[PDB]
Write a structure and sequence with these properties.
The structure is cut from a larger assembly and holds eight protein chains of eight kinds.
Chain A: H1 2-6, H2 31-47, H3 49-57
Chain C: H1 4-13, E1 19-24, E2 28-32, H2 37-61, E3 67-74, E4 77-83, E5 87-94
Antiparallel strand pairs in C: 1-2, 1-5, 3-4, 4-5
Chain H: E1 6-12, H1 27-37, H2 41-48
The chains are: A mainly alpha, B alpha+beta, C alpha+beta, D alpha+beta, E alpha+beta, F alpha+beta, G alpha+beta, H alpha+beta.
Amino acid sequence: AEIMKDHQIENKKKKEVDQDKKQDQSMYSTSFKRCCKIMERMVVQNDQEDKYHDYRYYWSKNEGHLLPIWRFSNEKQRKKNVTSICWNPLY
Amino acid sequence: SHLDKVQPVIKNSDMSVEMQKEVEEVAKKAIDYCNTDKEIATFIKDDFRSRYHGTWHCIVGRNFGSFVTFERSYYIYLYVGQLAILLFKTG
Amino acid sequence: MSEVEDTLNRIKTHKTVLGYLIVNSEGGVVRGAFKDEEESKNIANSIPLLTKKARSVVRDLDPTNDLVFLRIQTKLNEIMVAPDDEFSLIVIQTKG
Amino acid sequence: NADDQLKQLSALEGANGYVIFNESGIPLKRHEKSISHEKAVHIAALVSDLWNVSKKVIQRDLKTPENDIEVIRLRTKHSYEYIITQSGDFTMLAIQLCGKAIEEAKKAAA
Amino acid sequence: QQYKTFMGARVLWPPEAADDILEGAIRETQDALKKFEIAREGQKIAEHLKKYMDDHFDPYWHVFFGKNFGCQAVHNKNRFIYFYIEKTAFLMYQT
Amino acid sequence: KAVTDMDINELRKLMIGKAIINSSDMQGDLLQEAQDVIQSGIENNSAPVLNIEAACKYIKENLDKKFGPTWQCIIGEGYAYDVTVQNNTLLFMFYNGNLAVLIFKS
Amino acid sequence: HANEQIIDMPENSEMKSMKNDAFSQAKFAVENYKFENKISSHIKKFFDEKYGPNWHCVVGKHFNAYVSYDSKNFIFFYEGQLAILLYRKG
Amino acid sequence: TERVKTGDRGMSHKEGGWPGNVDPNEAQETGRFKKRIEKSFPQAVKDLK
C-alpha cells in the first residue's frame, strides 16, 4: 500500500460503485461470474471424471477402434440438423 | 490418537514439574479446541489467569524470538509441531 | 439477467449436488439452497473461516498469488469453494 | 526404492515440488527446486494447521460424524496447485503447474 | 525481613508493636475487609481503621496499605505494625 | 513498468531501509524516540545472518535505561499474541519483508 | 503525567523554599536511587535537615493512605510514574 | 513491599518443531532422526505419491 502511494503511477481502478440495489439481485455479476462459471465446470468435472480420465490418455496391427465419449444436444433443438461444424484456430 | 502424535516438547521451562505437566494438557486441549492461532493465545492466557491470578502475556506462532522480563518461576517455552506456546506473568 | 442466476439454477438442478450456498464477505447467507437448515447454518458459519485460513496458507508462500478456487475432498462428500472479495460460492457434491 | 518415487513425481507433467511431513511437523524429504529446510519448515506450519483445523471442523462444525478429509486442492493465481493428501501418519504437499505455466517454465529453461 | 503467619495474617515476626495492640489491630482489618473490599472503595477502609486506632489506643496513628510501596518512618517504642494479608501489605505507626 | 514490473522478490531487494507502522497506542512523541533506536539497533546486530535473540538483547536493555524498568519487546516472522499493557505504553511496527516488531511496557 | 496533585504547603511568608524542594529533591532522588524504600529515606533526611524533624514520607507505585499531619506541611505529587507523599506531624 | 523477581531471557523459535533429544541446528542429529523414520515409511510414500 505504501509502495503504491510512493510510485501514484497507474492508480488502481475498479471503483467501488458495485451493483448495490439492496435486494432483488445484489451484485451477483464481473469477478463473481468467473467464480460461478469455474464452479459449474468443476462440479461437472467430478461427475464426468471417469470419462475425462478416458478422454486424455485411454490410448484407445492394421486395425482401428473409435470410442464415442460425450454427446452435446438440447431437447428444444432436437428438430434441427447439425450441418456445418468448425474448431477455433487459437483454442 | 492425535494427542499421542502431537507429543508437545518443552525446550525451556523455568517452572515446577507439577505446573509444567498442567501446561502440556492445556497446550494440547487449546490446539484441538481452537480453529486459528489468534484463538490459541486467547484460550491459554484466560485459562491460566483463572487458575493462577495476575498479568499473563501469551505469544504463539511459526517463527519469532522473545527477550522478556517475567515473575521468576513463571515462564515456559514449549513448541508443538510448529507452534511455540510462550506464556509469562509480570508484576 | 438469466446469466449468473441461471448457471446457479443449472448447477443446483444438476444430479449428485446437495446444494449451492453464496456466503457474503462478512460470513452472511445471500442464497442457501440445501435440504435441512442445520447443515446450511453450519456451512454458513464454518466453511468461510476454513477458506480465510486456507487463503493465509497460499498467501504466506507467495503474497502476490491469491486463492482463485479451493476444493477439499472428504470420505463421503466433496466440498468446493470459489472465493471472491465481494462474495464466495460454496457447493457440496457427493463423489461418484 | 523410497527415493525413486521422488524421481517419479518430478517426472509427472507439471510437477515443480513436493514436501512430506511427519505427524510432528519435521519435513522428511523435499525437492531441490523448492527451498530445502527453510521453506520446508515454513510450509509444514501452514499445512499442518490447515489440515488439523479442517480435519477438526468437518467432524464437529459440519455435524457429520465419521467423515475424515482425504485430499485438499488449493488452486491459485498464475497456475500453482497445492495438493494435500494423507497416507497413515505422514502427509505431503505437491505443487503442479498448467500448460501455460509449464510452457513458460520450459521457455525460461531455454 | 523474616515474615510469619499468626491470626490468619502474614506479619514481620519480631513484632515491633506490643502483641495485644497488634492482635486487636489485625483482627479489626480482617473484619473491616470482610465488609469493604480494597479493589473498590479502598480509601474508605483506611479512614475506618485510622479512627478505630485513636479510639482504643493512643492518638495520631498513620495508616498506609498498598499492593506495592516502600517507606522509612520514625515511630514510638512498640508502636509499629506491618503485616501482609493475601497480597496486600498493611503498614501503620503511632506518633 | 512501475507496480506491474515490481515482484515481491524485486520489492524486498529494491528497498530494505523502508519503514511501515501498523498500530500505535503510544503517544506521538515517544514513538519518534523508540522507532530510531530499534531500526539502528537491529541493523547493527543483524550480523551476517539475522540473530533474532541478539536483536532483542539490544532493544530490551536500551528501552529499560531509556524509559522504565519492566519493558518487554519481541520480534518475529509471524505470530499471534494477546498482551495486557498499561495505557500509552505499546508500539507495533513491522520492518520491510518478513520482520514483525512488537514493543510494550508492562 | 501528574494530572491531579494535592498541594497543602504554606507558600506565603517565603516558605515556597519548603514546597519547591519537594518537587526538586523528588526528581533527583527517584532517578538515582531507583528503590522505593531508599527514596523515602533520602527525601525525609533532606526535609528534616532544613525544616526540623518529625517528617514522615511514603513512596509507592500503587497504595492507599489516610493520615494525620500538621496544617500547611503536607504535599502529594507524582514524580513521573511514581507517587511520592511527605508531611510533618509533631 | 517484596518486589517480585524479574528474570530476563531471550529465545528464538525461527527453527521448526523437532524432538528434545535432537538438536535443530546440528545437521548430524536431524540426518539420523530422518533415517530412523525411514525403517513402515517405504509403503506410505509409494501409496501416498
